[PDB]
Amino acid sequence: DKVLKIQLRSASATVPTKGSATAAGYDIYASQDITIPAMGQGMVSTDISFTVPVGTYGRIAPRSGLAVKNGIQTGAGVVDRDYTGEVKVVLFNHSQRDFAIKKGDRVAQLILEKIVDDAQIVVVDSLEESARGAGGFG
Amino acid sequence: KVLKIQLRSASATVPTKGSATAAGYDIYASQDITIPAMGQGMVSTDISFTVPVGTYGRIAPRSGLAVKNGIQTGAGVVDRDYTGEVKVVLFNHSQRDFAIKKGDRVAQLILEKIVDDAQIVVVDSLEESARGAGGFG
Amino acid sequence: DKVLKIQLRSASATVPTKGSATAAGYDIYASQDITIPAMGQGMVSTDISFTVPVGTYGRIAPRSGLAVKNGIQTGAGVVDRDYTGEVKVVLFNHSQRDFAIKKGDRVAQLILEKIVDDAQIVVVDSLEESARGAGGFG
Ligand SMILES: O=c1ccn([C@H]2C[C@H](O)[C@H](COP(=O)(O)O)O2)c(=O)[nH]1
Ligand SMILES: O=c1ccn([C@H]2C[C@H](O)[C@H](COP(=O)(O)O)O2)c(=O)[nH]1
Ligand SMILES: O=c1ccn([C@H]2C[C@H](O)[C@H](COP(=O)(O)O)O2)c(=O)[nH]1
Ligand code: NA
């Protein structure tokens, strides 16, 4: 499907918004003030729950300006389709300054990543030979 | 819709889905290791796998370890043609060392669907959009 | 409709390239020298713009080798299909070693992540009950 169902748990929540015509993601808004400490982390409230479309999960991904200006990086970020709790935004602050967040600030984005969510695990003896082979971390 | 998993030793665990319609498969450490505070490390899995056509394997974070322990996955892109042992790269952004024991779930594998057969083509200019050059706002 | 269009904004830019026959990503090249300081961050110029295919966004993802050998993690990372500015690579350096970048170095990789870009947002009083429910961060 294409339907993203959103539950607003309080008057402090904001419906996520699409910031441009073919934006990858939807802006997620803080529903409560919080400070993320320098070289530290915290969890931003949203007061929202959602059910992403079948064939996706909801990825909480960085708002680009916050990364550059404030050293902010999203942590965790995988929202499962069966999750009905409040979605929380985990933020790492890699800068030397505490970062102030106010209720209604855009703190991250939600991307409806398409995935294979019905895969069959098959245990095998070996994998198909490739030119890459075992080469990694080059 | 087939994920082929190779178990390379007795210390490997087949990855597992943590709920009915979980996005990801939990990945298990095959070794004990410490991820130093404000540092990083690499966790063995003793597994290899081949992701389905049109996907790559993203090594994504477990949510509890991020909140409780400051753990974040690094690197994280497993190509479909990789046949080596898959490694979990971990950053510890906390002030506390993080101990991992053999058999702990240290990350999750997500089969991210991608366009892996694009034609890359050089153009003089892109389609004009409302967004334009607007970035990092 | 599987075409990735790349605009080279200068002689210093390099068209991104696949590093193996079925690599997930296209390596992104620095167009200008820069140093990412130990326990710090920076922005890498590419002098490229691109329009990703319909149904995707461009994710600027980390190169594996730089993560383990240099402590490098990409920040931000979400390039919208309608972006026509210069694409910039945000790098965090989590190591104690300044990371020296030279024009022509591979600095990140571009992954054409498939997403639902035409979802309909529907606000509901409650989500469908699941066995997971509000269970998160377990
Ligand atoms: O960025 C975080 C990542 C996870 N979750 C919630 C939703 C997910 O389904 C997750 C699942 O928790 P465990 O399965 O790791 O317990 O917790 C948060 O709200 N957002
Ligand atoms: O978190 C990491 C990311 C990379 N790899 C391995 C598998 C990938 O295919 C990769 C590619 O190495 P280079 O192409 O970056 O050398 O190395 C690890 O096992 N897991
Ligand atoms: O790693 C970064 C992530 C974002 N952008 C650019 C392209 C995106 O479309 C973005 C959008 O800016 P805001 O919408 O966050 O203002 O800016 C960078 O070039 N690369
Ligand atoms: Na290779």
Side-chain angles (χ1 to χ4, degrees), chain A, chain B, chain C residues 2-138:
Chain A
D1 75 275
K2 312 260 198 269
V3 169
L4 170 58
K5 303 152 192 111
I6 309 291
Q7 177 196 37
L8 299 173
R9 302 159 73 90
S10 80
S12 292
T14 306
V15 183
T17 53
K18 205 167 219 261
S20 75
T22 74
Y26 297 85
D27 295 285
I28 293 157
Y29 300 80
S31 57
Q32 199 159 51
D33 294 357
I34 185 174
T35 297
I36 318 297
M39 308 297 184
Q41 73 182 270
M43 295 200 347
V44 187
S45 302
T46 62
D47 270 333
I48 74 170
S49 299
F50 51 80
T51 299
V52 299
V54 176
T56 76
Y57 75 99
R59 184 168 84 92
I60 309 298
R63 173 177 171 193
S64 78
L66 304 190
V68 175
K69 288 175 181 75
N70 310 290
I72 294 292
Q73 173 81 291
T74 46
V78 175
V79 184
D80 303 286
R81 173 161 56 92
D82 52 12
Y83 182 71
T84 69
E86 176 187 352
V87 174
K88 297 283 197 200
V89 177
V90 174
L91 296 183
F92 293 104
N93 174 357
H94 297 128
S95 85
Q96 312 207 107
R97 297 285 75 79
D98 292 357
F99 180 62
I101 284 159
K102 302 288 272 166
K103 183 202 119 137
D105 289 350
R106 293 179 325 258
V107 293
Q109 58 180 302
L110 170 60
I111 299 184
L112 307 177
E113 300 280 11
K114 288 192 171 162
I115 48 165
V116 173
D117 67 0
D118 56 357
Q120 186 190 323
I121 289 203
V122 174
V123 183
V124 302
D125 56 308
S126 59
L127 311 182
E128 191 105 276
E129 193 171 28
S130 69
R132 163 181 300 277
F137 301 103
Chain B
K1 287 176 197 82
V2 163
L3 163 71
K4 289 172 167 155
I5 310 275
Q6 169 189 214
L7 300 167
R8 305 161 64 98
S9 82
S11 299
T13 308
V14 182
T16 46
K17 280 183 161 169
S19 62
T21 157
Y25 299 82
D26 302 304
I27 295 162
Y28 300 78
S30 63
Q31 71 173 148
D32 302 348
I33 189 156
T34 291
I35 315 301
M38 304 285 173
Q40 75 184 85
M42 174 184 283
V43 190
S44 299
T45 67
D46 289 21
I47 68 167
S48 298
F49 54 73
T50 303
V51 296
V53 177
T55 70
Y56 74 100
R58 190 165 77 89
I59 314 297
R62 291 196 64 231
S63 80
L65 308 182
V67 166
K68 299 177 195 188
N69 308 283
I71 295 293
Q72 167 96 295
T73 50
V77 175
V78 180
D79 305 288
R80 174 160 59 83
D81 54 5
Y82 183 69
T83 66
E85 182 196 341
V86 174
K87 305 290 195 178
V88 179
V89 175
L90 293 181
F91 293 108
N92 180 350
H93 300 306
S94 82
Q95 286 155 322
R96 300 140 67 102
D97 295 344
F98 182 57
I100 293 169
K101 299 288 196 278
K102 172 190 305 182
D104 290 353
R105 294 173 289 166
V106 296
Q108 58 179 307
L109 170 61
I110 300 182
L111 310 172
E112 296 278 15
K113 283 186 184 175
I114 56 169
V115 171
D116 59 359
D117 62 348
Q119 283 294 288
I120 184 163
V121 309
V122 171
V123 290
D124 280 338
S125 60
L126 309 183
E127 270 216 278
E128 234 124 30
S129 67
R131 165 184 296 277
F136 303 96
Chain C
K2 277 174 184 186
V3 174
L4 169 61
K5 308 175 209 203
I6 308 294
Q7 179 191 45
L8 305 177
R9 303 170 61 98
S10 78
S12 294
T14 312
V15 178
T17 51
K18 286 183 170 184
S20 70
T22 70
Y26 298 87
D27 295 295
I28 302 168
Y29 297 80
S31 58
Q32 190 167 29
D33 293 358
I34 190 183
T35 302
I36 317 303
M39 306 305 285
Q41 66 189 91
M43 263 192 37
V44 189
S45 295
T46 62
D47 277 339
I48 72 170
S49 299
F50 55 73
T51 303
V52 303
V54 172
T56 75
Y57 70 102
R59 189 170 77 90
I60 300 167
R63 299 192 56 231
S64 65
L66 303 179
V68 305
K69 299 185 192 213
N70 302 271
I72 303 299
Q73 175 84 293
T74 47
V78 181
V79 184
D80 302 288
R81 186 166 72 202
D82 51 3
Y83 182 68
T84 61
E86 176 187 356
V87 174
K88 301 291 206 177
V89 176
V90 181
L91 293 184
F92 295 104
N93 179 355
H94 295 124
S95 89
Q96 294 187 35
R97 279 174 287 119
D98 292 351
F99 175 53
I101 301 173
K102 310 285 171 205
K103 165 156 53 201
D105 289 356
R106 295 183 303 235
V107 104
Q109 63 180 303
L110 170 63
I111 298 174
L112 306 181
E113 294 285 10
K114 278 175 168 183
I115 57 174
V116 173
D117 59 351
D118 56 355
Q120 293 292 136
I121 288 201
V122 168
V123 169
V124 299
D125 282 356
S126 67
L127 304 178
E128 168 87 345
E129 199 185 300
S130 76
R132 171 188 291 281
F137 306 99

